[PDB]
Amino acid sequence: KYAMAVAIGGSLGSQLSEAQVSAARVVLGNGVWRDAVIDVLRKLHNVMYGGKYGRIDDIAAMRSYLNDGTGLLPGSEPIVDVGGAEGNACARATILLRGFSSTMVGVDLKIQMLVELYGAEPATAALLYRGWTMQ
Amino acid sequence: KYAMAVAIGGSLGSQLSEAQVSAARVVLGNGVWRDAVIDVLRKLHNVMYGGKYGRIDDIAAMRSYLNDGTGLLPGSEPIVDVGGAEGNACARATILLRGFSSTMVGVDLKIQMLVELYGAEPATAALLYRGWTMQ
Amino acid sequence: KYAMAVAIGGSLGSQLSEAQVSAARVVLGNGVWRDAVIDVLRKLHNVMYGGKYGRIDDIAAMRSYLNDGTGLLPGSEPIVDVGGAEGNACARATILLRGFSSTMVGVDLKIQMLVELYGAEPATAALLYRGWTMQ
């Protein structure tokens, strides 16, 4: 949904509070995310953090960067730091879905977010870019 | 829904970003909006912009102002300017649904917004104004 | 829902506008709230306002404080003041559900809010606290 995406991606920012780090596992499932979630998260991380912390290449390298450690540029500090591993990984995954309400992420990636992260249909999410039908 | 209205009307403001201009076509349909949408949009535009840019009189003159051009006071500049026509009209339509979370728009118009713009029932949207049942 | 809770609890704050005071009766029902709503509201009021205005002890004393009057410390001014009784009581009830998006309220109470105030399942609201499944 559009409102769900907007609220989830506007509420959290720059400091994941004691109860915001799990917004990913709330929006997405809790088991293994399949491949479209991971590819969208990889594209979001690229667009939003490759200018400083280097990008990642493969969908399997996003998983290895997401859960356990890193894969960013050598010497660069973590994107986000909240606490232990089980919460730091979930925060590193959450910090990306705020890319919906960000001017850096294009409209096509916002549609891809609505399609893969949240439950929305491509034909009904297509009207995210402009167009007027004399309404 | 109340949360959908609040999030959609609080997220966007004063500068419709590259991917906010189509919030109207997202909330409303994409075809022709019928008459209740247009009347609510006309009332919102009156309340929110007639003090400066003049009001509009008829539901058919809201359509003619909405899609193609104007109809505001002679010499007054556009309410919002984002880009080409197909996106400028959708932005001029979007800039009104932020009237939910605005102190200028009364509570009766907020109920009318919930009833006509979003999908909500009048009997269940009636409890927008005060009243206490010893809960 | 998570997005509904976040939007409702982030939109309103510190000044309940002409059309925010009834967010409680919008989220909750309009009749008598049963006992879980009242206990969650009592815990929220304790955590958020007992440091200054004193806490309340019983679920039945939350009702007596909620609808008609008070029960706070002797000499302490009201938590929130909007207008007449029918709206002041609803504002005093609304000012608590903003505790979701507050660093003072713990994560267990956020889960309890999602479970009792809004419609969410305990097993599906349990993933509000950290944990990573190698997604």
Author numbering:
A (entry chain E), B (entry chain C), C (entry chain D): 1292 to 1426
Sentences from the paper on this structure:
RnMBV1 is a potential viro-control approach agent for restraining and controlling the white root rot disease, because the virus can confer hypovirulence to its host fungus. RnMBV1 is an approximately 52 nm bipartite dsRNA mycovirus composed of dsRNA-1 (8.9 kbp in length, AB512282) and dsRNA-2 (7.2 kbp in length, AB512283). The RnMBV1 capsid is composed of 120 chemically identical MCP subunits and additional surface CrPs.
Small-surface trimeric CrPs are present on the RnMBV1 MCPs at the 3-fold axes. The CrP is composed of C-terminal 135 residues (Lys1292–Gln1426) of the ORF3 in the genome segment dsRNA-2. In addition, each CrP displays α-helix-rich structures, which are formed of seven α-helices (HA–HG). The total interface area between each CrP trimer and three MCP_B subunits at the 3-fold axis is 2.6 x 103 Å2. The interactions are intervened by the hydrophobic interaction of the MCP_B loop Pro548-Lys555 and the CrPs and by one hydrogen bond between MCP_B Arg533 and CrP Gly1341. The CrPs are not present at all 3-fold axes. After 3D focused classification, one CrP trimer was recovered with highest intensity and was deemed to have 100% occupancy, whereas other CrP trimers were 30% occupancy. The averaged CrP trimer numbers per particle are 6.7 for full particles and 8.0 for empty particles, respectively. These results probably reflect their limited and weak interactions with MCPs.
